[PDB]
Design a binder for this molecule. Sequence first.
Ligand SMILES: [Mg+2]
Ligand code: NI
Ligand code: NI
Ligand code: NI
Lengths: 13, 151
Amino acid sequence: QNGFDNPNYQPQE
Amino acid sequence: GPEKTDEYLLARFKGDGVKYKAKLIGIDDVPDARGDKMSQDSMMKLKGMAAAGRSQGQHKQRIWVNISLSGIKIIDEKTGVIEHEHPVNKISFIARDVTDNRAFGYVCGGEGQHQFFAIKTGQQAEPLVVDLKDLFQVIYNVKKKEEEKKK
Ligand SMILES: [Mg+2]
Ligand code: NI
Ligand code: NI
Ligand code: NI
């Protein structure tokens, strides 16, 4: 019912 | 039916991956990389804006949502041009819409540049949402198995 995080996300470019 | 495997998912998403018919509700700057409440507030704002546009004869853009090991591509249906593209490691959160079985969205962008992309799917959104969950999981799984074997 809720959403979910992407464990592969990397904020720095 | 048969439970998924990493190899099944790798073959599913390699190269061109899979695609779904949809319309782009809107794109919103958001403060954080993740969050159900943040995402739903953005979805509601963008749907309000789309409804105002609709009252002035506007239509949402018809798109393909393409899902692959390369991330998410938003493709204009009429021309086939790639309008937006985010690699897996720049997608931070997938949001469902508790008010609408034919909407979902995703937060993407690097630091300080988080944006919510709100999507109206032609069919139910859930199969697309699950494809995104599986895409992220298999990439994570493969990475972790590589790391465990090198140590
Ligand atoms: Mg801005
Ligand atoms: Ni089964
Ligand atoms: Ni019209
Ligand atoms: Ni951030």
